[PDB]
């Protein structure tokens, strides 16, 4: 019933994010926009694990080691993890960014649901499905930018010959 | 007959992924109930167990031949909850015999508090048992006939026709 | 009443996109007909114009409260086609008065060849006019009541309730 | 009912082809497979325009100038163009490959429908919507390949310095 619409939300995030590979920054614009529009969370922050430390632009950087913290505990685990009572923060959906795998490429956390003051178990797995398209968009757009910068700087080194 | 066949089929098409399936499936089945029964509306209670006693707490409410599942999502703290001794919901939970109930006003045991919680006006009802494990899990009812005061027998056949399916879904 | 409202809503939640819309919407509306009217099945004929004369060629056929549009998609070369003088399909095409038809056997003009084309056994029917432009483009019928030989009046109300929408879709 | 599937088949071709950017050949495998599965055509061939000439692997190449031919006429136009009577070929859905635009990047042609011996008008626009995902996959995976080969051969020129 309403059931189709949140699948077509995945349609929207797909047809969007797969067309935004040209730049990860604009990709962040579209992602933050679509997420603040659909997740109903008043705010959010997206960690990205690196060996033993998470990385997040929320463009001032924010950092937190995989051993330390609760979201860091999610970095240790990759568990989707609702926090219906946060302690106007009042709840947090702390789930891994993921991508190709359940392996922790990062740790997203939504804050302050619209419709139902608490995050539901419904406010979990759907965010993970959204994080399928987002995770592919991240891993592959970064896959794009790394090849860009590196292989471009290579011909920058080509200079003398 | 084919009706029930591709109706429950098209009903399973209507479902899409979210959380989030079987309950809305029973919802759509309530829709089909209030349709082929030509009812104004319908409703269902979970009969979920606690203290060793299943309790017929209300779930779907003011279900029409539609009424969105989102509309029917009553808070468990706020949901009406029937113990086995109260209502024909808990009485079917207590007896599980198939029950034509031509007039709840006469074929009693019924709790008319459902009229309070739903705002619907009860006149008559029917029911069949629905169970999972040792536990009971559901009770289902048609509400206000549109065209006439009462069903004839093949409508009761329709009532089995989709309450058997509701029996099939919440398991 | 909410029924038809969220019925047509949920009916639009039934569908993605194909070719392949409005006729199939009228199809699902025929489903809602054979449901809320508790009919065994239903059918619709396009009344598409030619030679200045609209022709009530059969389209949807053996529609149940279900039945896929492919199940009902007869070849235009093979479709049964009614001129204005044949059948109550072409007679509603010829008169456009609302028609309760309690018994086609008595309330005649009806073409029982539809029983041949569909394999269904006609007993009674009802109809309302449906037009695009100056042209007429549709005729609609419910088929075999499940619980009784005939409708009571508010079922006729449901009949208007969705044939009016059928008028609304193919325009 | 039946009326809600073919778009999710576009979800299938999306989740497939957008994940197969790493190589064009595998992209062709998934495309030929998904197309011979969904189009109900017994066979097909996909032209790709280059200024005034189409290009096709159907891996022996096949070529036809944009001015010459009926499919070439489609290259001249980009009109979707059913041919219910082809002359076991019996029909051809000749529609442009397209991509970002109605501009003719190429000219696909499906052959021999299952379910209804003729191609329908239904057997047109759906192929175009399928060609949205396929066209983006082509333009952008080839966008990926050109960057690969070129920027790689650049560091191959970097070798001396």
DSSP states of A69-104 as a string? SHHHHHHHH---EEESS------EEEEE--SSSSS-
User: Which residues in chain B are contacts of D1 at CB distance < 8 A?
Assistant: 6, 9-10, 13
D114 contact C CB<8A: no
Q: Chains C and D: how many Cβ contacts under 8 Å?
A: 33
Burial class (CB in 10 A: 0-12, 13-18, 19+), D137: buried
Residues in chain A whose C lies over 2.5 Å from the next residue's N (breaks after)? 58, 87
Residue of chain B whose alpha carbon sits nearest to that of A129: B18
Q: How far apart are CA C104 and CA C126, in angstroms?
A: 9
In contact, A85 and A70? CB cutoff 8 Å: no
Residue of chain D whose alpha carbon sits nearest to that of C66: D1
Experimental resolution (Å): 11.0
Instruction: Give me the helix-helix angle, A122-158 and A5-17, nearest 10°.
Output: 10
- Strand, coil or helix: D54: strand
Would the CB atoms of B31 and C10 count as touching at under 8 Å? Answer: yes
In contact, B37 and B151? CB cutoff 8 Å: yes
Q: Please, what's the largest Cα pairwise distance for chain A? A: 64
- Strand, coil or helix: C122: coil
Shortest Cα–Cα distance, B16 to chain C (Å): 9
Which CA distances in Å does A43 have to A33, B21, C66, C101?
11, 29, 45, 62
Would the CB atoms of A157 and D161 count as touching at under 8 Å? Answer: yes
Shortest Cα–Cα distance, C42 to chain A (Å): 24
Extract the runs of DSSP E, i.e. beta strands, from B6-90.
39-46, 49-50, 53-54, 56-63, 81-82
Q: How far apart are CA B99 and CA B111, in angstroms?
A: 15
Would the CB atoms of A154 and D159 count as touching at under 8 Å? Answer: no
What determination technique applies here?
cryo-EM
A158 contact D CB<8A: yes
Which H helix or E strand runs over A142? helix A122-158
Q: How far apart are CA C10 and CA C8, in angstroms?
A: 6
Q: What angle do CA D60, D64, D67 make, to 5 degrees?
A: 170
In contact, C110 and C122? CB cutoff 8 Å: yes
Q: How far apart are CA C29 and CA D103, in angstroms?
A: 40
Q: How far apart are CA D102 and CA D82, in angstroms?
A: 17
State the residue for tokens 């003011």. B62
In contact, D44 and D147? CB cutoff 8 Å: no
- Strand, coil or helix: A38: helix
Pairing of strands B130-132, C99-101: unpaired
The pair of structure tokens assigned to B96 is 């599980």
Q: How far apart are CA B157 and CA B151, in angstroms?
A: 10
In contact, D126 and D39? CB cutoff 8 Å: no
Shortest Cα–Cα distance, D7 to chain B (Å): 13
Q: What angle do CA D141, D147, D151 make, to 5 degrees?
A: 160
Shortest Cα–Cα distance, B165 to chain A (Å): 19
Q: What is the CA radius of gyration of chain A?
A: 17
Q: Chains A and B: how many Cβ contacts under 8 Å?
A: 34
For residue A93, list its beta bridge partners.
Answer: A82, A110
D1 contact A CB<8A: no
Q: How far apart are CA C4 and CA C22, in angstroms?
A: 17
Would the CB atoms of A3 and C10 count as touching at under 8 Å? Answer: no
Would the CB atoms of B16 and A126 count as touching at under 8 Å? Answer: no
User: Which residues in chain B are contacts of C64 at CB distance < 8 A?
Assistant: 2-3, 6-7
Q: Measure CB to CB from residue A14 to each of D14, D147, D154 and give the nearest one.
A: D14
Nearest one of D130, D151, D144, D139 to D48, comparing CA atoms:
D139
Which CA distances in Å does C3 have to A65, A101, B81?
55, 45, 27
**Long-range interactions of C147-150: CB distance < 8 A, separation 24+:** C147/B151, C147/B152, C147/B153, C147/B154, C147/B155, C147/B157, C147/B158, C147/C38, C148/B152, C148/B154, C149/C123, C150/C102, C150/C124
Q: How far apart are CA A124 and CA A103, in angstroms?
A: 17
3-state SS string over D88-118? CCCCEEEEECCCCCCCCCCEEEEECCCCCCC
Q: How far apart are CA B89 and CA B96, in angstroms?
A: 10
Q: What angle do CA C150, C70, D108 make, to 5 degrees?
A: 160
Pairing of strands C81-82, C56-63: antiparallel
Would the CB atoms of C157 and B146 count as touching at under 8 Å? Answer: yes
First to last CA, chain C: 25
Task: Give the dihedral of Cα atoms B82, B84, B90, B95; nearest 10 deg.
Answer: 180
DSSP H helical segments within chain D, as ranges?
6-17, 24-38, 70-77, 122-157
State the residue for tokens 């394999």. C119
Residue of chain D whose alpha carbon sits nearest to that of C70: D2
Which CA distances in Å does D24 have to A34, C20, D13?
31, 33, 15
Enumerate residues 6+ apart whose C-beta is below 8 A from C77. Answer: none
User: Which residues in chain D are contacts of C69 at CB distance < 8 A?
Assistant: 1-3
Q: What are phi and psi of D131, to 5 degrees?
A: -85, -5
Pairing of strands D43-47, D107-111: antiparallel
Would the CB atoms of C16 and D1 count as touching at under 8 Å? Answer: no
Among B19, B21, B75, the residue to mutate for chain A (most A Cβ within 10 A):
B19
Among D6, D13, D15, D146, the residue to mutate for chain A (most A Cβ within 10 A):
D15
DSSP summary character for residue A120: P
Nearest one of B86, B91, B85 to B129, comparing CA atoms:
B91
In contact, D91 and D84? CB cutoff 8 Å: yes
DSSP summary character for residue C86: S
**Long-range interactions of D83-88: CB distance < 8 A, separation 24+:** D83/D119, D84/D118, D84/D119, D85/D118, D86/D111, D88/D42, D88/D112
Which H helix or E strand runs over A9? helix A5-17
Would the CB atoms of C32 and B28 count as touching at under 8 Å? Answer: no
DSSP H helical segments within B70-122, as ranges?
87-95, 113-118
Nearest one of C127, D159, B35 to A161, comparing CA atoms:
D159
Residue of chain A whose alpha carbon sits nearest to that of C13: A1
Residue of chain A whose alpha carbon sits nearest to that of C9: A1
Shortest Cα–Cα distance, D127 to chain B (Å): 24
Which H helix or E strand runs over C80? none
Residue of chain D whose alpha carbon sits nearest to that of A149: D151
Shortest Cα–Cα distance, C124 to chain D (Å): 28
Q: How far apart are CA A118 and CA A86, in angstroms?
A: 10
CB count in 10 Å sphere of residue C93: 28
Q: Please, what's the largest Cα pairwise distance for chain C? A: 43
Query: C34: phi > 0 → left, psi -120 to 50 → alpha, else beta; which?
Result: alpha
Dihedral sign, Cα of residue D84, residue D86, residue D91, residue D95: negative
Among D1, D4, D7, the residue to mutate for chain B (most B Cβ within 10 A):
D1
- The length of chain D is 161
Would the CB atoms of B6 and D4 count as touching at under 8 Å? Answer: no
Q: How far apart are CA B134 and CA C161, in angstroms?
A: 44
Dihedral sign, Cα of residue C110, residue C113, residue C119, residue C121: positive
């Amino acid at each position: 019933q309403k059931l189709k619409c949140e699948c077509q939300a995945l349609l929207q995030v797909a047809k969007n994010l797969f067309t935004h590979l040209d730049d990860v920054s604009v990709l962040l614009q579209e992602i933050i926009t679509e997420a603040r529009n659909l997740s109903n969370a008043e705010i959010c922050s997206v960690f990205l694990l690196d060996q033993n430390e998470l990385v997040a632009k929320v463009s001032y950087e924010i950092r937190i080691p995989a051993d330390q913290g609760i979201a860091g505990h999610v970095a240790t685990t990759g568990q989707i993890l609702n926090i219906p009572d946060a302690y106007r923060t009042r709840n947090i959906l702390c789930f891994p960014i993921k991508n190709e795998n359940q392996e922790v490429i990062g740790v997203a956390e939504l804050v302050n649901k619209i419709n139902g003051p608490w995050f539901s178990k419904f406010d979990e797995d759907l965010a993970t499905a959204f994080s399928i398209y987002c995770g592919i968009s991240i891993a592959h757009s970064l896959l794009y930018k790394k090849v860009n910068e590196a292989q471009y700087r290579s011909h920058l080194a080509n200079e003398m010959m | 007959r084919l009706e029930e066949c591709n109706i429950l089929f098209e009903l399973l098409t209507e479902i899409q992924d979210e959380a989030g399936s079987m309950e809305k499936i029973v919802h759509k089945t309530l829709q089909r109930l209030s349709q082929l029964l030509a009812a104004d509306r319908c409703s269902m209670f979970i009969c979920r167990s606690r203290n060793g006693i299943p309790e017929v707490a209300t779930r779907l409410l003011n279900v029409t031949p539609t009424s969105k599942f989102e509309d029917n999502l009553v808070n468990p703290d706020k949901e009406t909850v029937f113990p086995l001794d109260i209502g024909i919901a808990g009485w079917v939970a207590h007896t599980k015999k198939f029950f034509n109930i031509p007039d709840v006003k006469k074929n009693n045991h019924f709790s008319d508090y459902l009229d309070k919680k739903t705002g619907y006006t009860t006149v008559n009802m029917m029911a069949i048992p629905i169970t999972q494990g040792k536990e009971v899990l559901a009770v289902v009812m048609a509400l206000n006939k549109l065209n006439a005061s009462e069903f004839s027998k093949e409508d009761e056949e329709v009532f089995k026709k989709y309450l058997n399916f509701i029996s099939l879904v919440l398991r």
